[PDB]
Amino acid sequence: QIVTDNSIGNHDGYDYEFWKDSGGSGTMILNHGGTFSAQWNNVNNILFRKGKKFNETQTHQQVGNMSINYGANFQPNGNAYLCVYGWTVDPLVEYYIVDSWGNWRPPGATPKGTITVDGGTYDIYETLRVNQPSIKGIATFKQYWSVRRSKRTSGTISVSNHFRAWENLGMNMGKMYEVALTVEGYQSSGSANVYSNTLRINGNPLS
Numbered sequence: 331q332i333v334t335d336n337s338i339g340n341h342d343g344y345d346y347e348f349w350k351d352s353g354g355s356g357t358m359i360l361n362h363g364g365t366f367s368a369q370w371n372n373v374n375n376i377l378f379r380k381g382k383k384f385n386e387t388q389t390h391q392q393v394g395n396m397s398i399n400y401g402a403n404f405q406p407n408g409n410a411y412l413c414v415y416g417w418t419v420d421p422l423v424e425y426y427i428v429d430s431w432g433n434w435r436p437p438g439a440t441p442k443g444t445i446t447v448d449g450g451t452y453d454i455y456e457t458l459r460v461n462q463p464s465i466k467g468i469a470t471f472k473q474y475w476s477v478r479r480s481k482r483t484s485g486t487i488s489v490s491n492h493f494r495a496w497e498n499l500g501m502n503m504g505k506m507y508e509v510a511l512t513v514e515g516y517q518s519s520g521s522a523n524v525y526s527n528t529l530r531i532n533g534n535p536l537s
């Protein structure tokens with residue numbers, strides 16, 4: 331249950347993933363349910379996550395209401411994100427709902443709107459990745475973001491509310507590939523202890 335190199339699997343009912351490119355190091359310890367701990371040092375790009383991977387046949391509406399209750403002790407040294415993350419396919423989209431970050435509030439673009447949800451106010455952004463690694467090969471795809479205005483590291487993220495706000499703004503979503511509580515680092519080091527992470531789909535916790 332010690333993962334220090336790329337790996338995709340299921341642990342205690344959650345689909346876990348460790349992903350990095352070359353350079354630096356990371357260690358992910360898979361703990362009960364949706365929980366896990368992460369440590370990274372001098373990485374180029376690293377992601378740690380536990381959630382649900384889907385079979386690419388359903389819209390988020392078809393999957394149902396998605397909500398994540400979480401808690402994490404997040405200690406980044408540099409650029410890193412504490413978020414809900416995932417992808418859609420057809421179209422291929424990488425998405426983020428960011429509740430905390432390190433020294434840099436992402437994602438560097440001009441906001442396209444705002445959403446109020448879960449007692450916070452999030453700025454909404456759309457960015458473009460060109461010929462970058464993805465879940466479907468080296469590709470050019472959009473990234474969708476909701477970024478909280480101030481940091482928090484525990485609470486509930488009403489994931490489906492963000493998806494409806496994005497679609498309201500014309501940020502087209504495809505079939506669901508994944509939704510997961512994620513820690514991402516970029517050119518940084520840090521630690522994160524995700525001590526609470528429950529994904530409920532139509533109110534039912536994952537198992």
Ligand SMILES: O[C@@H]1[C@@H](O)[C@H](O)OC[C@H]1O
Binds near residue numbers: 463
């Ligand atoms: O799962 C990995 C993704 O999250 C990362 O961003 O880049 C490529 C994918 O394989």
